[PDB]
Design a protein around this ligand. Structure first.
Ligand SMILES: NC[C@@H]1O[C@H](O[C@H]2[C@@H](O)[C@H](O[C@@H]3[C@@H](O)[C@H](N)C[C@H](N)[C@H]3O[C@H]3O[C@H](CO)[C@@H](O)[C@H](O)[C@H]3N)O[C@@H]2CO)[C@H](N)[C@@H](O)[C@@H]1O
Ligand SMILES: [Mg+2]
Ligand SMILES: [Mg+2]
Ligand SMILES: [Mg+2]
Ligand SMILES: [Mg+2]
Ligand SMILES: [Mg+2]
Ligand SMILES: [Mg+2]
Ligand SMILES: [Mg+2]
Ligand SMILES: [Mg+2]
Ligand SMILES: [Mg+2]
Ligand SMILES: [Mg+2]
Ligand SMILES: [Mg+2]
Ligand SMILES: [Mg+2]
Ligand SMILES: [Mg+2]
Ligand SMILES: [Mg+2]
Ligand SMILES: [Mg+2]
Ligand SMILES: [Mg+2]
Ligand SMILES: [Mg+2]
Ligand SMILES: [Mg+2]
Ligand SMILES: [Mg+2]
Ligand SMILES: [Mg+2]
Ligand SMILES: [Mg+2]
Ligand SMILES: [Mg+2]
Ligand SMILES: [Mg+2]
Ligand SMILES: [Mg+2]
Ligand SMILES: [Mg+2]
Ligand SMILES: [Mg+2]
Ligand SMILES: [Mg+2]
Ligand SMILES: [Mg+2]
Ligand SMILES: [Mg+2]
Ligand SMILES: [Mg+2]
Ligand SMILES: [Mg+2]
Ligand SMILES: [Mg+2]
Ligand SMILES: [Mg+2]
Ligand SMILES: [Mg+2]
Ligand SMILES: [Mg+2]
Ligand SMILES: [Mg+2]
Ligand SMILES: [Mg+2]
Ligand SMILES: [Mg+2]
Ligand SMILES: [Mg+2]
Ligand SMILES: [Mg+2]
Ligand SMILES: [Mg+2]
Ligand SMILES: [Mg+2]
Ligand SMILES: [Mg+2]
Ligand SMILES: [Mg+2]
Ligand SMILES: [Mg+2]
Ligand SMILES: [Mg+2]
Ligand SMILES: [Mg+2]
Ligand SMILES: [Mg+2]
Ligand SMILES: [Mg+2]
Ligand SMILES: [Mg+2]
Ligand SMILES: [Mg+2]
Ligand SMILES: [Mg+2]
Ligand SMILES: [Mg+2]
Ligand SMILES: [Mg+2]
Ligand SMILES: [Mg+2]
Ligand SMILES: [Mg+2]
Ligand SMILES: [Mg+2]
Ligand SMILES: [Mg+2]
Ligand SMILES: [Mg+2]
Ligand SMILES: [Mg+2]
Ligand SMILES: [Mg+2]
Ligand SMILES: [Mg+2]
Ligand SMILES: [Mg+2]
Ligand SMILES: [Mg+2]
Ligand SMILES: [Mg+2]
Ligand SMILES: [Mg+2]
Ligand SMILES: [Mg+2]
Ligand SMILES: [Mg+2]
Ligand SMILES: [Mg+2]
Ligand SMILES: [Mg+2]
Ligand SMILES: [Mg+2]
Ligand SMILES: [Mg+2]
Ligand SMILES: [Mg+2]
Ligand SMILES: [Mg+2]
Ligand SMILES: [Mg+2]
Ligand SMILES: [Mg+2]
Ligand SMILES: [Mg+2]
Ligand SMILES: [Mg+2]
Ligand SMILES: [Mg+2]
Ligand SMILES: [Mg+2]
Ligand SMILES: [Mg+2]
Ligand SMILES: [Mg+2]
Ligand SMILES: [Mg+2]
Ligand SMILES: [Mg+2]
Ligand SMILES: [Mg+2]
Ligand SMILES: [Mg+2]
Ligand SMILES: [Mg+2]
Ligand SMILES: [Mg+2]
Ligand SMILES: [Mg+2]
Ligand SMILES: [Mg+2]
Ligand SMILES: [Mg+2]
Ligand SMILES: [Mg+2]
Ligand SMILES: [Mg+2]
Ligand SMILES: [Mg+2]
Ligand SMILES: [Mg+2]
Ligand SMILES: [Mg+2]
Ligand SMILES: [Mg+2]
Ligand SMILES: [Mg+2]
Ligand SMILES: [Mg+2]
Ligand SMILES: [Mg+2]
Ligand SMILES: [Mg+2]
Ligand SMILES: [Mg+2]
Ligand SMILES: [Mg+2]
Ligand SMILES: [Mg+2]
Ligand SMILES: [Mg+2]
Ligand SMILES: [Mg+2]
Ligand SMILES: [Mg+2]
Ligand SMILES: [Mg+2]
Ligand SMILES: [Mg+2]
Ligand SMILES: [Mg+2]
Ligand SMILES: [Mg+2]
Ligand SMILES: [Mg+2]
Ligand SMILES: [Mg+2]
Ligand SMILES: [Mg+2]
Ligand SMILES: [Mg+2]
Ligand SMILES: [Mg+2]
Ligand SMILES: [Mg+2]
Ligand SMILES: [Mg+2]
Ligand SMILES: [Mg+2]
Ligand SMILES: [Mg+2]
Ligand SMILES: [Mg+2]
Ligand SMILES: [Mg+2]
Ligand SMILES: [Mg+2]
Ligand SMILES: [Mg+2]
Ligand SMILES: [Mg+2]
Ligand SMILES: [Mg+2]
Ligand SMILES: [Mg+2]
Ligand SMILES: [Mg+2]
Ligand SMILES: [Mg+2]
Ligand SMILES: [Mg+2]
Ligand SMILES: [Mg+2]
Ligand SMILES: [Mg+2]
Ligand SMILES: [Mg+2]
Ligand SMILES: [Mg+2]
Ligand SMILES: [Mg+2]
Ligand SMILES: [Mg+2]
Ligand SMILES: [Mg+2]
Ligand SMILES: [Mg+2]
Ligand SMILES: [Mg+2]
Ligand SMILES: [Mg+2]
Ligand SMILES: [Mg+2]
Ligand SMILES: [Mg+2]
Ligand SMILES: [Mg+2]
Ligand SMILES: [Mg+2]
Ligand SMILES: [Mg+2]
Ligand SMILES: [Mg+2]
Ligand SMILES: [Mg+2]
Ligand SMILES: [Mg+2]
Ligand SMILES: [Mg+2]
Ligand SMILES: [Mg+2]
Ligand SMILES: [Mg+2]
Ligand SMILES: [Mg+2]
Ligand SMILES: [Mg+2]
Ligand SMILES: [Mg+2]
Ligand SMILES: [Mg+2]
Ligand SMILES: [Mg+2]
Ligand SMILES: [Mg+2]
Ligand SMILES: [Mg+2]
Ligand SMILES: [Mg+2]
Ligand SMILES: [Mg+2]
Ligand SMILES: [Mg+2]
Ligand SMILES: [Mg+2]
Ligand SMILES: [Mg+2]
Ligand SMILES: [Mg+2]
Ligand SMILES: [Mg+2]
Ligand SMILES: [Mg+2]
Ligand SMILES: [Mg+2]
Ligand SMILES: [Mg+2]
Ligand SMILES: [Mg+2]
Ligand SMILES: [Mg+2]
Ligand SMILES: [Mg+2]
Lengths: 272, 49
RNA sequence: GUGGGAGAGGGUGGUGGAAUUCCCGGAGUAGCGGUGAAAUGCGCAGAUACCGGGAGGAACGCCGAUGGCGAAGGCAGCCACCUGGUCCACCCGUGACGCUGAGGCGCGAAAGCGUGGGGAGCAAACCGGAUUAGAUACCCGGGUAGUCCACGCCCUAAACG
RNA sequence: CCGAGGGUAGGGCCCGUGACUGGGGCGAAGUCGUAACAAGGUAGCUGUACCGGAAGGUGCGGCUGGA
RNA sequence: CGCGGGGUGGAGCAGCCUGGUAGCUCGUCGGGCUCAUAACCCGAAGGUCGUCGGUUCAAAUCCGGCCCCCGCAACCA
RNA sequence: UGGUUCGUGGAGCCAUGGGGGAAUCUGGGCGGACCACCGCCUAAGGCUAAGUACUCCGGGUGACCGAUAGCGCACCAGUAC
RNA sequence: GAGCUAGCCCUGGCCAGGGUGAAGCUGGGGUGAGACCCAGUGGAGGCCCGAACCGGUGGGGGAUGCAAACCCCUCGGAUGA
RNA sequence: GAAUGCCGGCAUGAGUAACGAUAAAGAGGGUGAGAAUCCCUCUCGCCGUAAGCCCAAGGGUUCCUACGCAAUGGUCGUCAGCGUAGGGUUAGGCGGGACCUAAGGUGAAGCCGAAAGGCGUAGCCGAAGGGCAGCCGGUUAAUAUUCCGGCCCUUCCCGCAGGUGCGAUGGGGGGACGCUCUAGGCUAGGGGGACCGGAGCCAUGGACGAGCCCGGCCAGAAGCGCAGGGUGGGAGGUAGGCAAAUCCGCCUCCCAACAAGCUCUGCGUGGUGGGGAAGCCCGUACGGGUGACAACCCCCCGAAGCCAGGGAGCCAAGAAAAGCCUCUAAGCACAACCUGCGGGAACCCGUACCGCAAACCGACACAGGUGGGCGGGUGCAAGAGCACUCAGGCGCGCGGGAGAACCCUCGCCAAGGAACUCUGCAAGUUGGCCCCGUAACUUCGGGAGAAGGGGUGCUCCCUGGGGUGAUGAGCCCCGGGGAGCCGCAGUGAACAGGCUCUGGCGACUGUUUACCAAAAACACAGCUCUCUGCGAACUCGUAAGAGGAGGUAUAGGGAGCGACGCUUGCCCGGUGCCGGAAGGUCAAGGGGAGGGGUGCAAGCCCCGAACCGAAGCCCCGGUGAACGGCGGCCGUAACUAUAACGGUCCUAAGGUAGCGAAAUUCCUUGUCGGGUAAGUUCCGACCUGCACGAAAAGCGUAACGACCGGAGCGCUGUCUCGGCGAGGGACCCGGUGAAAUUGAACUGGCCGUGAAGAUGCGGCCUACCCGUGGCAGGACGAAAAGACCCCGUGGAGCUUUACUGCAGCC
RNA sequence: CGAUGUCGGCUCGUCGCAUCCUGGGGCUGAAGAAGGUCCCAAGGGUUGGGCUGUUCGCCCAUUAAAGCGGCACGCGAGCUG
């Protein structure tokens, strides 16, 4: 839906906030299962190695369930859907009959009170997790494992999915959010449905501060700098570059493919 | 204005203390040099309890 | 009111095959495209033609009509749900409840605009090849928006009987 | 007290005028081209859209005021 | 003032660096097609190569001096 | 690749990171590519005084200084600062 | 050497008092149901005024200074990057 | 004898500048060898969201006292923060530690690295964070939440007494958390009182008065009382909470739905304890007595603090660990644990003093800098603002005179107002609240404090709302209406916008050259291109490792553009990037035709042609929100002029829209129009754009701006054009007493001359000796071994299709 | 070049005369008035504004006249910037 504001201030005239109506009466989270201390820090042991990180709201990590094959066969009741500061998506709090409480990343269409479960069994319904094999060709799916028993790694961003395209002996072909065509092992779990919160892309930050709230420090142009700092630094009053556009570290930034050629992963990929 | 000396007993101790110098080869040599020199004070005297 | 009937009437969801284009594997060569005639173009870096497999989008051949439905705009593969109008019979009910309609409100082809998706074919713009005195045209080879979906605007028409 | 009016401040409407600019109408025999009327030599007209010295061309759908 | 590039039939360009032959398109002229013009077709004419000098057997061409034209430069003060 | 006077040089010898990879005296290395001949040695385990170096320390002497010299310090100086 | 300064991490503190009055909510009006419109309420905001506080715009002073960046007047921001 | 040489000493300026805020001083007395400077008293002034009091950091004897004045004190000094001596800092309850974890550090296991060393789950370390039992008074010259008095708590350890399966570093619960807005009851704090307490007081015209002045609390267990926070109770089933649990989670029947009940705090009350003014009298450097048997009460205001884990809303979604409760495991249940009661035991360190400053940071008793808490009263709409003032503390450690110039800071000015000037620079004007009333334009919020106005004091009369009180008094906030008084003037002093039109640039709040640039620069939402499939790309590290990210294409990296509106044309020949199992070339290596060297020979040793050989380049395509680029010359219309039109040469293609003498325009003050008496600026136009142009975006744009330009109104000392006044200096006296500079000097003008700018040479003129206050023309005056310039086969930072390497990738 | 501050402005002047005015005068194609042109003569005078940093210059309104030039394009231990 997206919340919109009137221009009672500049920067409030474009600003735009998510709709939280799917956030069920459960705004503060769940101890026990999560949260952990989350360790803010824009850099490695010592030095900054990703520029322009820092500031922005304190967070608690929700330790979510990315391998659903523990509770094969054990169903769970979806108890709530809550805000997760550390991902684009929303998260489902679910209660297993087992007693155990996990969070699943919350797919589009998930309703509270719903039944959900994981395993070879598993009715093909939104919320359920299955090894890729038993899932019908053509169904859209998410939180897909890359290699079996290694955890969900594909399609967890808000409003993303992959679609099952066909099969090939032990592998089923996937069409990933990027549009790539991937052979992913049959035995990999993946949960049916799309991610949801799909209006995430429609949000307009609206002002500088908002950027900072999310811990995004001001990014400065190479043009703004000096020859010591950047290939684009200097010279006089503005300058068009004077070389093929580059990163600060000298590599070209328009076109230069960067995936290494001889990756053994290659023989499992069929697209862009 | 604000000048450059902003005394702190803990800082002076953690930074220039006998135990800090002892911790690394760089520092151990400092004690060696100061000893051979005949320095009355190997490290700065940080006070208080 | 009761009992029916026909229909591309409308909305949503789903699904079928033909063909085009692209990719892949096979087999196969020296030309294929195209026009008034040509050329650009594609083709031994393996084209066109043929077989097989895959993906994707769009439009629904036959039935099909000088035909049907809608108030128009318009609606055409099949299926299901939701739904509007409509005509017939029986003459049961109400009982003048009727007609029109300034404004208002809703609908309103195509093109266009916004945001996002989609993009096989086609194709403004644009580029080449011919044609001409010159072609910013007609013919040919390419090709982008757009054409498709959702939602929101736009309100026009030889919107014509 | 009110009070003609005078002063100050800011608006509304209309008239005149203004370097320059836009298109328009009109003016026997100036320029370029051929758009339309015969299948006008690309049926024409059209709402929209893009492009072009100019008539105009082309795209999309429509129309019979064409076969 | 300095630099380097350019003047060729009526128009716009070739030909020079490897000196001897000046060619291309348009135009102009004569004829045809046409009722007539153009288009189109068939034939033809047309260049002291900016001037002054000499280098050579021979200069559009190579070398100097001027003459117009074009373009760049003229900074640190 | 280093080492040797040796800087690729006709470049051996000695050491070695990489690849290949033996033999036990009729076995193996060297004498400056290489080969023949004549000689010299016996790798892939280790230890080994003495002669040699230095002077915080004690002593001795000086065609060494004599408080701006001589050690930074003749003096509670690596101090005060 | 980050006891200055620049960034970041952890954990605390601070921001007087005034304005302006967003969504929302309630009632009413409207409609087939709406959209929407009125009030009242509500207290939003890199909103406004302005101390503390963080600055350093203009001018004057100061120039062996009070000060190796100061003083006076003036001025920017001040719930937020 | 020179090195702007080095070290030391003493000169010069010079009794010159200064003596560190313009809050400020006067006097009497004392002391002393000596007093503006010490002590005291009176008078005066300054501070008072401090210049007052309490914490912290830092400092470290600076605190108190006695005795001192050589030096330290910008003067003096009997004084001191100085010298000598002695004294002084008292805790189970405050802080820290025998408690806990955060970042981060260390680090067993382990991984890595020539050595040094680097990484690192567990644990350990690590605090203004969590946990955590003392409040009020009295005493010392100097310490007190530490000593003492009262009253009250906490741990342990040992006993008795009564309960119960007790019991882990393990399970679970709890601890436990954001921002903004807040309700209800309280407390702190404050205001008032005809009521209570109290020494005293009638002045100077009147007042012996419901008079003036002063003061009317504090702490406090149990138990209540009032506010409020916390929390459902059973029984089943049980596969999860990494063993086991009765606990916890989940599921299902029931009983509650309430704060009923349990609790747990805050406040009030409370056994008791304690304080207690002005004033007067004393002798202190300061405190002592009396006042007093002090009284110790009633209203009202009221927090930002307390109840607190309170409530509502919002998005950016808000530490961990122990204590604490509970669950069970080994085991042990003569153990142990829980409760009540005694008794015993309770360590280590800090505690002085300074603390917005003369004691900390600035070489100084330096006008600077330094975190937290309290910060009274009246009046001003409010307030931490402003003026005065409580408590409390200061007059800033040189003074005395004078009343020149000139300077600083301040006040006023006739007539005129921007004529001043690069510029209204500066200064004025304006100024708070309340109420009227507000244009273009617009993104419909704004522009808006638009502009422009009016009201503002005091008195009397009438009247309407609340809050606390019972529905009433009072006390307390908000209001309305009517008459009237005074002054030049009623936010009467202090704090408190000048306004408008219009361009340029940038959207906007923001950011920056600490110490000359705050901007039109950076940033910014937003747009686009691009890389990236997850052991992601990329970044740091030799590595291990880490960041990215405990993220996964709606994500992350890189680049450019920079809200938003409309838009972003044509060129792929070159460079880049992307795509091409062909071809050409291409290194090691394979391959050996063939040749050579020694050997009597077997052999050993060398070169070595075909051909097989990658990436790369060449080559073939694509690609411009990739690097970039986007023509010349002729002729033409029936007045001329101009050229829609034609010709031709060239290119990879020859700039479209929009804009244009511009932050771009050389010629230039282009040419017209506008403002003006007059305009090299400005605005609007034209277009011949030297040399705009479409994401190093183009053209616009409401709002915004300590941005830059132009105009106008208002107003004024900027100016005509100055004048007067104030105070701090300046000057004179007393005290103290520097500086750069300095070849030596007995240091005049002109006209010449001289290395070409002479006090110093020539000639002539002038000229008694020495100061003081002033002005700055000169001594090529001081200050910095010119920054500009050049030179040096001097140095650095930066670049690239310079050379040669290296990382890196292939 | 071990430093001679560099435009313009302001302030203060002062000097040359090849004189802008005023005074004296010869020639005039000088009737007069007013001009023109040369000679003598610096004693004194030689305006306020619009534009531009401007010197300069073009304007506006005047004037007896709106002089030219030197003094380190006079003068920053005098000011501005
Ligand atoms: N005339 C009416 C409107 O204006 C235009 O018309 C104007 C022009 O286009 C037109 O020009 C014509 C030209 O077309 C034609 N080929 C040649 C002719 N000599 C010109 O003629 C014109 O100019 C001449 C002198 O100059 C005058 O005397 C005469 O009146 C006038 N018509 O003359 C008209 C002026 O009168 C549109 N073309 C026309 O269709 C439109 O409806
Ligand atoms: Mg936890
Ligand atoms: Mg480290
Ligand atoms: Mg940036
Ligand atoms: Mg820069
Ligand atoms: Mg670089
Ligand atoms: Mg430039
Ligand atoms: Mg360039
Ligand atoms: Mg550059
Ligand atoms: Mg139907
Ligand atoms: Mg009937
Ligand atoms: Mg009708
Ligand atoms: Mg329509
Ligand atoms: Mg359409
Ligand atoms: Mg468009
Ligand atoms: Mg669209
Ligand atoms: Mg978007
Ligand atoms: Mg096509
Ligand atoms: Mg075509
Ligand atoms: Mg295509
Ligand atoms: Mg209509
Ligand atoms: Mg009137
Ligand atoms: Mg008009
Ligand atoms: Mg025609
Ligand atoms: Mg036609
Ligand atoms: Mg036609
Ligand atoms: Mg059309
Ligand atoms: Mg076209
Ligand atoms: Mg002819
Ligand atoms: Mg220079
Ligand atoms: Mg230069
Ligand atoms: Mg070597
Ligand atoms: Mg060599
Ligand atoms: Mg080896
Ligand atoms: Mg050997
Ligand atoms: Mg050998
Ligand atoms: Mg040998
Ligand atoms: Mg030999
Ligand atoms: Mg030997
Ligand atoms: Mg041996
Ligand atoms: Mg030995
Ligand atoms: Mg001697
Ligand atoms: Mg000595
Ligand atoms: Mg001596
Ligand atoms: Mg010495
Ligand atoms: Mg720091
Ligand atoms: Mg406030
Ligand atoms: Mg309502
Ligand atoms: Mg409202
Ligand atoms: Mg607010
Ligand atoms: Mg604000
Ligand atoms: Mg503000
Ligand atoms: Mg405060
Ligand atoms: Mg300032
Ligand atoms: Mg301020
Ligand atoms: Mg403010
Ligand atoms: Mg000396
Ligand atoms: Mg003197
Ligand atoms: Mg003096
Ligand atoms: Mg003096
Ligand atoms: Mg003083
Ligand atoms: Mg005496
Ligand atoms: Mg006062
Ligand atoms: Mg002492
Ligand atoms: Mg003392
Ligand atoms: Mg004494
Ligand atoms: Mg003294
Ligand atoms: Mg002093
Ligand atoms: Mg004495
Ligand atoms: Mg003492
Ligand atoms: Mg102990
Ligand atoms: Mg500890
Ligand atoms: Mg610990
Ligand atoms: Mg370590
Ligand atoms: Mg604590
Ligand atoms: Mg404690
Ligand atoms: Mg004390
Ligand atoms: Mg006490
Ligand atoms: Mg006690
Ligand atoms: Mg626990
Ligand atoms: Mg009290
Ligand atoms: Mg009394
Ligand atoms: Mg009396
Ligand atoms: Mg009282
Ligand atoms: Mg009490
Ligand atoms: Mg268990
Ligand atoms: Mg008393
Ligand atoms: Mg709460
Ligand atoms: Mg622990
Ligand atoms: Mg138990
Ligand atoms: Mg103490
Ligand atoms: Mg104390
Ligand atoms: Mg303080
Ligand atoms: Mg002092
Ligand atoms: Mg101080
Ligand atoms: Mg100090
Ligand atoms: Mg402060
Ligand atoms: Mg207060
Ligand atoms: Mg007050
Ligand atoms: Mg008050
Ligand atoms: Mg006020
Ligand atoms: Mg104040
Ligand atoms: Mg006093
Ligand atoms: Mg005046
Ligand atoms: Mg006056
Ligand atoms: Mg006036
Ligand atoms: Mg002026
Ligand atoms: Mg002037
Ligand atoms: Mg101006
Ligand atoms: Mg001003
Ligand atoms: Mg305005
Ligand atoms: Mg009045
Ligand atoms: Mg403009
Ligand atoms: Mg800006
Ligand atoms: Mg600066
Ligand atoms: Mg700053
Ligand atoms: Mg600013
Ligand atoms: Mg500044
Ligand atoms: Mg944009
Ligand atoms: Mg690193
Ligand atoms: Mg990692
Ligand atoms: Mg991570
Ligand atoms: Mg990105
Ligand atoms: Mg930019
Ligand atoms: Mg757009
Ligand atoms: Mg472009
Ligand atoms: Mg190109
Ligand atoms: Mg190409
Ligand atoms: Mg290319
Ligand atoms: Mg390639
Ligand atoms: Mg080879
Ligand atoms: Mg190759
Ligand atoms: Mg174009
Ligand atoms: Mg122009
Ligand atoms: Mg004018
Ligand atoms: Mg003009
Ligand atoms: Mg203009
Ligand atoms: Mg530009
Ligand atoms: Mg151009
Ligand atoms: Mg561009
Ligand atoms: Mg821009
Ligand atoms: Mg613009
Ligand atoms: Mg604008
Ligand atoms: Mg600002
Ligand atoms: Mg600004
Ligand atoms: Mg004045
Ligand atoms: Mg005075
Ligand atoms: Mg004196
Ligand atoms: Mg003399
Ligand atoms: Mg001379
Ligand atoms: Mg002389
Ligand atoms: Mg002499
Ligand atoms: Mg003198
Ligand atoms: Mg002076
Ligand atoms: Mg000098
Ligand atoms: Mg020099
Ligand atoms: Mg230079
Ligand atoms: Mg050289
Ligand atoms: Mg010089
Ligand atoms: Mg000198
Ligand atoms: Mg004369
Ligand atoms: Mg005369
Ligand atoms: Mg004169
Ligand atoms: Mg003016
Ligand atoms: Mg000016
Ligand atoms: Mg000049
Ligand atoms: Mg003069
Ligand atoms: Mg000159
Ligand atoms: Mg000068
Ligand atoms: Mg000057
Ligand atoms: Mg001078
Ligand atoms: Mg300047």
């Amino acid at each position: 839906a997206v919340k919109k504001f009137k221009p009672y201030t500049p920067s409030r005239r474009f600003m735009t906030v998510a709709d939280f109506s799917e956030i069920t009466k459960t705004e503060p989270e769940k101890s026990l299962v999560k949260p952990l201390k989350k360790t803010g820090g824009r850099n490695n042991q010592g030095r900054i190695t990703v520029r322009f990180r820092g500031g922005g709201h304190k967070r608690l990590y929700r330790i979510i369930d990315f391998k659903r094959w523990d509770k094969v066969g054990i169903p769970a009741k979806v108890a709530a859907i809550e805000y997760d500061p550390n991902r684009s998506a929303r998260i489902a709090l679910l209660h297993y009959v087992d007693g155990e409480k996990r969070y699943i990343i919350a797919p589009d269409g998930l309703q509270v009170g719903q039944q959900v479960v994981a395993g070879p069994d598993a009715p093909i319904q939104v919320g359920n997790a299955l090894p890729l094999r038993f899932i019908p060709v053509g169904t859209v799916v998410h939180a897909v494992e890359l290699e079996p028993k290694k955890g969900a790694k594909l399609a967890r961003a808000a409003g993303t999915s992959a679609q099952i395209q066909g099969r090939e002996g032990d592998y089923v072909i996937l069409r990933l959010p990027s549009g790539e065509l991937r052979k992913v092992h049959g035995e990999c779990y993946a949960t049916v449905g799309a991610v949801g919160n799909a209006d995430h892309k429609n949000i307009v930050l609206g002002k500088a501060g908002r950027s900072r709230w999310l811990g995004r420090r001001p990014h400065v142009r190479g043009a703004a700098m000096n020859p010591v700092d950047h290939p684009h630094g200097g010279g006089e009053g503005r300058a068009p570059r004077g070389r093929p556009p580059a990163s600060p570290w000298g590599w070209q930034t328009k076109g230069l493919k960067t995936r290494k050629r001889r990756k053994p992963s290659s023989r499992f990929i069929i697209a862009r | 204005m604000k000048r450059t000396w902003q005394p702190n007993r803990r800082k002076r101790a953690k930074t220039h203390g006998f135990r800090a110098r002892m911790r690394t080869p760089g520092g151990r040599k400092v004690l060696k040099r100061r000893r051979q020199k005949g320095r009355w004070r190997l490290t700065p005297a940080v006070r208080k309890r």
